[PDB]
Design a binder for this molecule. Sequence first.
Ligand SMILES: *[C@@H]1O[C@H](CO)[C@@H](O[C@@H]2O[C@H](CO)[C@@H](O[C@@H]3O[C@H](CO)[C@@H](O)[C@H](O)[C@@H]3O)[C@H](O)[C@H]2NC(C)=O)[C@H](O)[C@H]1NC(C)=O
Ligand SMILES: *[C@@H]1O[C@H](CO)[C@@H](O[C@@H]2O[C@H](CO)[C@@H](O)[C@H](O)[C@H]2NC(C)=O)[C@H](O)[C@H]1NC(C)=O
Ligand SMILES: *[C@@H]1O[C@H](CO)[C@@H](O[C@@H]2O[C@H](CO)[C@@H](O)[C@H](O)[C@H]2NC(C)=O)[C@H](O)[C@H]1NC(C)=O
Ligand SMILES: *[C@@H]1O[C@H](CO)[C@@H](O[C@@H]2O[C@H](CO)[C@@H](O)[C@H](O)[C@H]2NC(C)=O)[C@H](O)[C@H]1NC(C)=O
Ligand SMILES: *[C@@H]1O[C@H](CO)[C@@H](O[C@@H]2O[C@H](CO)[C@@H](O)[C@H](O)[C@H]2NC(C)=O)[C@H](O)[C@H]1NC(C)=O
Ligand SMILES: *[C@@H]1O[C@H](CO)[C@@H](O[C@@H]2O[C@H](CO)[C@@H](O)[C@H](O)[C@H]2NC(C)=O)[C@H](O)[C@H]1NC(C)=O
Ligand SMILES: *[C@@H]1O[C@H](CO)[C@@H](O[C@@H]2O[C@H](CO)[C@@H](O)[C@H](O)[C@H]2NC(C)=O)[C@H](O)[C@H]1NC(C)=O
Ligand SMILES: *[C@@H]1O[C@H](CO)[C@@H](O[C@@H]2O[C@H](CO)[C@@H](O)[C@H](O)[C@H]2NC(C)=O)[C@H](O)[C@H]1NC(C)=O
Ligand SMILES: *[C@@H]1O[C@H](CO)[C@@H](O[C@@H]2O[C@H](CO)[C@@H](O)[C@H](O)[C@H]2NC(C)=O)[C@H](O)[C@H]1NC(C)=O
Ligand SMILES: *[C@@H]1O[C@H](CO)[C@@H](O[C@@H]2O[C@H](CO)[C@@H](O)[C@H](O)[C@H]2NC(C)=O)[C@H](O)[C@H]1NC(C)=O
Ligand SMILES: *[C@@H]1O[C@H](CO)[C@@H](O)[C@H](O)[C@H]1NC(C)=O
Ligand SMILES: *[C@@H]1O[C@H](CO)[C@@H](O)[C@H](O)[C@H]1NC(C)=O
Ligand SMILES: *[C@@H]1O[C@H](CO)[C@@H](O)[C@H](O)[C@H]1NC(C)=O
Ligand SMILES: *[C@@H]1O[C@H](CO)[C@@H](O)[C@H](O)[C@H]1NC(C)=O
Ligand SMILES: *[C@@H]1O[C@H](CO)[C@@H](O)[C@H](O)[C@H]1NC(C)=O
Ligand SMILES: *[C@@H]1O[C@H](CO)[C@@H](O)[C@H](O)[C@H]1NC(C)=O
Ligand SMILES: *[C@@H]1O[C@H](CO)[C@@H](O)[C@H](O)[C@H]1NC(C)=O
Ligand SMILES: *[C@@H]1O[C@H](CO)[C@@H](O)[C@H](O)[C@H]1NC(C)=O
Ligand SMILES: *[C@@H]1O[C@H](CO)[C@@H](O)[C@H](O)[C@H]1NC(C)=O
Ligand SMILES: *[C@@H]1O[C@H](CO)[C@@H](O)[C@H](O)[C@H]1NC(C)=O
Ligand SMILES: *[C@@H]1O[C@H](CO)[C@@H](O)[C@H](O)[C@H]1NC(C)=O
Lengths: 363, 482, 111, 111, 166, 220
Amino acid sequence: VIGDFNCTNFAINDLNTTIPRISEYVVDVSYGLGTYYILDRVYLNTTILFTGYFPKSGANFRDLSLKGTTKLSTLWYQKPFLSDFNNGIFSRVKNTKLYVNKTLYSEFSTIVIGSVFINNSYTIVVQPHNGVLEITACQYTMCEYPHTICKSIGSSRNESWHFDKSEPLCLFKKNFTYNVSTDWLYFHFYQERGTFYAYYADSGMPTTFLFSLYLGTLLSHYYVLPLTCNAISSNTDNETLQYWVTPLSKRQYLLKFDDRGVITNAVDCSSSFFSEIQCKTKSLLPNTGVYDLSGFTVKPVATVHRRIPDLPDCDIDKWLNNFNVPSPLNWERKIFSNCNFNLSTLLRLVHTDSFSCNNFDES
Amino acid sequence: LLKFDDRGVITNAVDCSSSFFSEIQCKTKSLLPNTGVYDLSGFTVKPVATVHRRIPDLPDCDIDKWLNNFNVPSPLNWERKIFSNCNFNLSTLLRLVHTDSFSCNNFDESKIYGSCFKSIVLDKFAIPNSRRSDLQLGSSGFLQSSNYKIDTTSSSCQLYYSLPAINVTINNYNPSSWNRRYGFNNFNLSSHSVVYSRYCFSVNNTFCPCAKPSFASSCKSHKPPSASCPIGTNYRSCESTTVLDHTDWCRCSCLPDPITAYDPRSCSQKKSLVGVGEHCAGFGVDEEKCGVLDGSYNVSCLCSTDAFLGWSYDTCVSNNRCNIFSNFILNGINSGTTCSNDLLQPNTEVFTDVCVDYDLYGITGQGIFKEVSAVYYNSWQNLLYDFNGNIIGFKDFVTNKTYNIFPCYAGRVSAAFHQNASSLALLYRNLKCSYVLNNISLATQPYFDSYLGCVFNADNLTDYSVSSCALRMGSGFCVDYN
Amino acid sequence: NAQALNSLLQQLFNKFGAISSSLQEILSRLDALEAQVQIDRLINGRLTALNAYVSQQLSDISLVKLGAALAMEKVNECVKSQSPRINFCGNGNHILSLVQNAPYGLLFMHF
Amino acid sequence: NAQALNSLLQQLFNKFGAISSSLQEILSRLDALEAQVQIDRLINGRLTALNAYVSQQLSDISLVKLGAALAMEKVNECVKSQSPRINFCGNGNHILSLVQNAPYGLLFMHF
Amino acid sequence: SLFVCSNYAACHDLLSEYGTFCDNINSILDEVNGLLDTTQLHVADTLMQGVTLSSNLNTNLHFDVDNINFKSLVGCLGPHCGSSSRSFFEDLLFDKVKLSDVGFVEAYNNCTGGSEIRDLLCVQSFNGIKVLPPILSESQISGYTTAATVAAMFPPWSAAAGIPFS
Amino acid sequence: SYRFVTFEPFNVSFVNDSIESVGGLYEIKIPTNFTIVGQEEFIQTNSPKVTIDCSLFVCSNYAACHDLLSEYGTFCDNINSILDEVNGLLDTTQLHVADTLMQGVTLSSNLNTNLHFDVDNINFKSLVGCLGPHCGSSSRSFFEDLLFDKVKLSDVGFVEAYNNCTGGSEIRDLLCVQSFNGIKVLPPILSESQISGYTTAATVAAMFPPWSAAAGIPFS
Ligand SMILES: *[C@@H]1O[C@H](CO)[C@@H](O[C@@H]2O[C@H](CO)[C@@H](O[C@@H]3O[C@H](CO)[C@@H](O)[C@H](O)[C@@H]3O)[C@H](O)[C@H]2NC(C)=O)[C@H](O)[C@H]1NC(C)=O
Ligand SMILES: *[C@@H]1O[C@H](CO)[C@@H](O[C@@H]2O[C@H](CO)[C@@H](O)[C@H](O)[C@H]2NC(C)=O)[C@H](O)[C@H]1NC(C)=O
Ligand SMILES: *[C@@H]1O[C@H](CO)[C@@H](O[C@@H]2O[C@H](CO)[C@@H](O)[C@H](O)[C@H]2NC(C)=O)[C@H](O)[C@H]1NC(C)=O
Ligand SMILES: *[C@@H]1O[C@H](CO)[C@@H](O[C@@H]2O[C@H](CO)[C@@H](O)[C@H](O)[C@H]2NC(C)=O)[C@H](O)[C@H]1NC(C)=O
Ligand SMILES: *[C@@H]1O[C@H](CO)[C@@H](O[C@@H]2O[C@H](CO)[C@@H](O)[C@H](O)[C@H]2NC(C)=O)[C@H](O)[C@H]1NC(C)=O
Ligand SMILES: *[C@@H]1O[C@H](CO)[C@@H](O[C@@H]2O[C@H](CO)[C@@H](O)[C@H](O)[C@H]2NC(C)=O)[C@H](O)[C@H]1NC(C)=O
Ligand SMILES: *[C@@H]1O[C@H](CO)[C@@H](O[C@@H]2O[C@H](CO)[C@@H](O)[C@H](O)[C@H]2NC(C)=O)[C@H](O)[C@H]1NC(C)=O
Ligand SMILES: *[C@@H]1O[C@H](CO)[C@@H](O[C@@H]2O[C@H](CO)[C@@H](O)[C@H](O)[C@H]2NC(C)=O)[C@H](O)[C@H]1NC(C)=O
Ligand SMILES: *[C@@H]1O[C@H](CO)[C@@H](O[C@@H]2O[C@H](CO)[C@@H](O)[C@H](O)[C@H]2NC(C)=O)[C@H](O)[C@H]1NC(C)=O
Ligand SMILES: *[C@@H]1O[C@H](CO)[C@@H](O[C@@H]2O[C@H](CO)[C@@H](O)[C@H](O)[C@H]2NC(C)=O)[C@H](O)[C@H]1NC(C)=O
Ligand SMILES: *[C@@H]1O[C@H](CO)[C@@H](O)[C@H](O)[C@H]1NC(C)=O
Ligand SMILES: *[C@@H]1O[C@H](CO)[C@@H](O)[C@H](O)[C@H]1NC(C)=O
Ligand SMILES: *[C@@H]1O[C@H](CO)[C@@H](O)[C@H](O)[C@H]1NC(C)=O
Ligand SMILES: *[C@@H]1O[C@H](CO)[C@@H](O)[C@H](O)[C@H]1NC(C)=O
Ligand SMILES: *[C@@H]1O[C@H](CO)[C@@H](O)[C@H](O)[C@H]1NC(C)=O
Ligand SMILES: *[C@@H]1O[C@H](CO)[C@@H](O)[C@H](O)[C@H]1NC(C)=O
Ligand SMILES: *[C@@H]1O[C@H](CO)[C@@H](O)[C@H](O)[C@H]1NC(C)=O
Ligand SMILES: *[C@@H]1O[C@H](CO)[C@@H](O)[C@H](O)[C@H]1NC(C)=O
Ligand SMILES: *[C@@H]1O[C@H](CO)[C@@H](O)[C@H](O)[C@H]1NC(C)=O
Ligand SMILES: *[C@@H]1O[C@H](CO)[C@@H](O)[C@H](O)[C@H]1NC(C)=O
Ligand SMILES: *[C@@H]1O[C@H](CO)[C@@H](O)[C@H](O)[C@H]1NC(C)=O
């Protein structure tokens, strides 16, 4: 369950229909996947080392594109489908084309991003409408079991993923268009210091800037909503849905630019030894030679923590809060040894005002 | 450069900056240097004009109209307004508000006038008098550790001012959806009472601050209050045992409060810090003190107002003027559409093929412009950079014309000196005499063009052969004296 | 030589712990009080780079002088005459040699 | 060579004006604000030590190359043949020489 | 990345400003080692310029002609000159000092599993300072010197101007 | 793919012959047919002469930087002095090489070098420059043309590159940026045309009488 509002209970099965499948797909950054354009930079025919929020090469994608016809299972609204949004995600979406009455119809999944998913915390919603990308972020009163339908062919149910009879007061609401006759779309979503960022690309694998919204809080979980259409899963001869998501990380990338300013290649710079050789050489095809690679300290396998057994309490609070406070002419002194103390409790119980140190720190 | 004789009387003096010969004398620390070739630096070509480019008329920012608003909030919920695509006067803004102090870190006062920024981020909250000293940089006080963290690695400006005590309302509203979910209403505090949080706690999405009613029915000694939180939430970790004098004693987690819990590891709510650009995570609710006694799957989970704790409040009044904090966050330095107009300068069209200083929308420096026609700039792409952080061309905002920025000439000048001659035999290497004449300096001495460059104060007679020259300039050319 | 000059040129874009590798940004962001420590860091780093470069240049030029002395002996003993030294001019039974000019050196063709 | 490596190893335990010569104590006593200046002092001192070491290594390897060229001429002119150079191979009236392998060099036994 | 900053993230992040110094240091050491390798190759090549050996050379039995003993100077006496061509004379030289290239290899080999802590080579190797073996092993150079000596010995007397040694 | 093998760069040449004196006689391979082969060798005599100044490199045109550099001015004086003595040593070495190219050289005045160039059936036309009496402009030989066209960054190349720096439309060149940042490669005190003329004179004196460089005897 993703919300707390009970909208409806039609066509639901919960009799342990346990067939969840998460597909995998290796991440190939070596042609421009997961790379975005800098906001005001043009580089021509050069190779630049750049650090940014990037997907990790050699990892795996994750196909969260659910698909249903009538039934809504209860296993579609828990982990691992209700996934983890810790720093940010990079998305790769298939653009499903439906040919109804010799007319193109593009439709794919709807992604929601939030923290708690109730109507006192904001929720970023991205939802297409036949080539128009609606990106809104308000306090949506989303249902316990969300739902998305197919505009080209109506399914057995109506669309029901929020109960906002009146538009809630909020911050961001905008419309975006794109080339509706495309095959794959790429999305960068990440957050940094309380501001939510978003990058977009439709034609070409490198990504460009879209917008940036400030929220004031953090994002915790994202979820790809299930879609219900009838012309898609018709005897599995037609097309399907592919929504591939990978987590983001702050790692150095090596990028290559051509004469037009388009990113042609990318290197992870930390995936393997070969990538590290490429990033040290600042090229993609280094000359024949022997290279020495450092950073080869063996990782520890365990931790040992030794303390002397149970020692009496120091009672620093009981001496500091004594009722006989002396003058600076005769300052007192009490030496503490062979005793354990809690610094947080000691700071809390006495009515402190300031506590600073020199040549040493608090942490 | 001064010379003293045996009596201590100054006999000679050198200007050290009048001419090349004086510079040779001052480098040599003598008046009659030996015969040789000297290289003299400090030969960057002076700019001949200035080009200053600004975006045309943008609306006023009205920073004064937002700073002097009559609804000042708490450090628990600090407001923020982002300013872009607007022009501002810093002097008028500082003057009209009743400022007291305005200091900055990693950036100064004098470089704000006539400068461009991508955006200006401003945060505002009232200062309680008890925690006034908490706002100093690097101090880990209750304001800096639970309400508002000040970044120290970013170019920021801190502003202190005050509004008159009347016409002031205090907006108290905690931005914690977790606290609002389990029954937290508005505050009950007097006017000019500024509330600040002392500890912030973060929980997971599946939190539920109530006990299981089925387990609550079995608990007969110290039975906790029970309710019914919505689905997807795991209940409390209350478990029953025997304390060797009671048949059934059941204890719960976070006894008695998350602040003073003897076992914080098993407690779900954890004490947390706050990052820059983020609010307080929440208020640690007392688990046992809140709830409904004997609630069996019929009452949703709510908690009392007094259950939430870990905050104290004070007042803003100091000599009938409530002091207000402000924090300027300047990002995108020397680039962007938000420029200051205190150093007012009319817009100047871009010149071509002349060494001029430029102020192209915040980017400063000097260079030579050569206009070309290249269309690799997209809608967002607007500046062309070298492979390591160097501007090598841009595209104008208004005229959409592609330009290139080339560096100005910064060569050196040679000087051939002989002891018997009081003059110099100069040599500007790899140059032509026409470029030296009109673009560098006029010739008061006979100049000629040679293979190595343009030679000054030495006639061109490269037909004779000399088998011994003490003044060699290279490639078989020597400058003797006669 | 081109690589050495390129490395010395790339030494100009090192931060050395300062806020910016370029003096223009420092002088346009700081005013003569905290600017001075950044400028001192840049100056100390660039002076260290220059001292390392001139030491390496001294070693390289000493090696060049030694090779040129070898070339002078090679001209004296193999081209203008034939000293009875086995395998000094060329590998195998030497006959004579001829000298031709080369970019930064000479070219010997041992027959 | 052992003394040079030992000196370079002992360079790692110099305070250079910092509170501790080891990075573990500094990173366990300071938190990224006053730690940075101490780590900068340690880095600058160790980089100066490395630059001095590589300059001395360059000079030593140049001397080794010159000695090896002398060894090549000694092999060419004293072992395989006998050039008429007085007191080049050995002191006194020379007869012949033989070459044997040695650790980091050759061994010439002049007779 | 081992000497200046061993395994600490803050030190490695602060070292990124001075990364050009590290690239220069590694490049200088690389060209120094390349010069050393070229010099070793030139010495090995000039050890054999006009050398010429005979196939019918069973060096285990004909080793002392003209009443002169070169058994100690000539290695791999016989037809098994594939394993170790080191001569008896070089045995004293290579046993008087133990820290040769083979000594360095055997010392760095005995570094992972051991009960001794006062050795300096293991500490140096763990702190990024390591002495790599040369591109030619001393067994090959010993075989080269043996080949030169035998060429001076027997017909055709390549290293002795085509004439009997006596 | 990657094969890990042994590295044996040098080995002896074997000859199937007896190693014993039968009948008082040994066995050896006397050559019966011969040829003349050649081999080239390049020895580096000169190096580029680089000059670096603080008042452009460390501090380009900024008053505060130049004022702060006054404390460390002794370092800049030492750097300039060290580079000056390095370039002086290079110039002295070049002069010594040019002098030792012609020690006892002696040419004939009646030497019209364009028509009499190959006597005794040996061609020196490619090795001898300025064929004729016009040896004032360029004495570079035909043999040196391949050498000086294979590499373009000679001293003449540096001069032509620094010349084409003030007026142009190209920005990716490194030499202009280096020269504007105070790093510049000055031409040597002797041009390579003069050294080519010296080598040509040495070769001709080795060939034609009086045979100064060939010990007073015909070359064949
Ligand atoms: C913000 O979200 C909360 C949480 O969902 C909303 O409160 C919930 O509102 C619904 C209907 O508005 C309530 O459902 C009702 O339940 C009674 C029980 O007898 C039933 O008879 C009604 O027909 C209806 O289904 C629900 O109880 C209530 N509380 C919870 C915990 O879900 C709230 O309305 C939202 N606010 C806005 C402005 O949308
Ligand atoms: C883009 O950069 C490449 C690489 O520097 C350029 O290719 C070089 O072109 C020059 C022509 O002057 C050749 O001498 C080099 O050998 C080329 N190098 C490689 C690796 O190909 C290419 O010319 C540049 N393109 C443009 C339009 O300037
Ligand atoms: C963004 O574009 C979409 C599609 O054109 C808009 O959705 C329609 O809005 C109209 C009202 O303007 C409604 O009558 C339709 O029912 C909507 N269509 C669907 C499929 O919901 C949307 O309103 C636009 N958003 C904004 C902010 O202009
Ligand atoms: C202060 O800002 C204003 C606009 O925000 C600048 O523009 C002047 O505005 C006044 C009225 O607000 C007009 O009467 C003037 O004609 C405007 N132009 C000029 C050139 O004064 C104003 O210049 C700014 N102040 C300063 C000192 O630059
Ligand atoms: C410079 O380029 C910008 C970016 O395209 C132009 O801004 C828009 O251009 C489109 C088509 O070129 C017009 O339809 C829009 O009306 C323009 N926007 C506005 C607000 O006018 C801009 O017009 C270009 N400048 C010119 C052509 O002088
Ligand atoms: C430069 O000055 C020197 C020093 O006076 C000149 O050398 C003198 O010349 C005069 C006149 O010929 C003689 O009487 C002196 O005996 C010379 N002194 C020495 C120490 O040589 C020199 O002639 C001047 N001119 C040049 C071209 O060097
Ligand atoms: C400095 O040099 C530049 C070019 O090297 C000169 O610019 C051109 O000068 C010619 C000669 O009068 C004019 O016909 C052109 O119109 C000029 N071009 C431009 C773009 O202005 C420049 O005149 C020289 N400086 C001076 C003072 O003469
Ligand atoms: C510098 O002087 C030389 C020597 O006279 C000049 O070279 C002569 O130039 C004229 C005119 O082009 C030619 O007819 C002669 O044949 C050249 N003689 C030689 C020996 O080269 C040279 O032109 C002069 N340079 C300047 C700028 O006046
Ligand atoms: C002359 O030839 C005779 C061959 O008979 C050599 O005599 C042999 O010398 C070897 C020493 O290498 C001894 O081991 C043999 O026992 C000798 N055999 C006989 C039959 O005497 C003799 O050495 C040769 N002369 C010289 C000066 O070497
Ligand atoms: C001996 O002298 C004769 C002179 O007649 C040489 O013959 C000439 O050789 C040149 C080669 O440089 C040819 O170009 C001529 O055509 C030859 N002339 C005749 C008449 O044969 C001959 O080359 C000399 N001998 C040697 C070995 O050089
Ligand atoms: C949710 O609502 C549906 C109709 O909208 C209703 O049939 C169902 O009983 C509700 N679920 C509850 C009350 O748990
Ligand atoms: C969709 O809404 C219509 C509106 O009348 C309703 O008749 C229909 O039953 C709904 N579909 C469902 C609940 O699946
Ligand atoms: C949309 O993408 C398709 C993909 O092949 C392309 O052919 C088409 O030209 C694109 N549309 C536009 C308007 O560029
Ligand atoms: C403050 O409020 C009083 C009373 O409402 C009013 O007279 C006065 O003008 C107000 N001051 C300002 C600055 O608005
Ligand atoms: C809030 O404060 C006012 C004034 O002190 C008081 O009259 C009122 O009862 C308080 N509200 C509650 C719920 O106690
Ligand atoms: C909270 O969730 C995190 C994962 O986001 C998990 O690692 C942790 O154990 C959870 N803690 C509690 C008390 O549920
Ligand atoms: C380690 O093993 C090597 C053999 O490879 C041996 O020479 C050496 O002495 C051993 N080290 C010790 C301390 O015994
Ligand atoms: C010996 O060297 C020659 C030439 O380098 C080579 O052709 C031959 O194969 C070598 N013999 C070996 C490696 O046994
Ligand atoms: C040398 O030649 C002889 C005569 O043909 C032959 O008997 C002998 O086997 C050869 N030895 C070799 C090829 O090693
Ligand atoms: C020597 O070789 C040449 C060609 O290589 C040939 O013409 C000539 O007849 C040969 N002479 C002998 C004696 O073999
Ligand atoms: C500049 O002119 C010189 C002739 O002095 C020429 O060799 C060079 O190629 C030119 N440069 C360019 C980029 O054309």
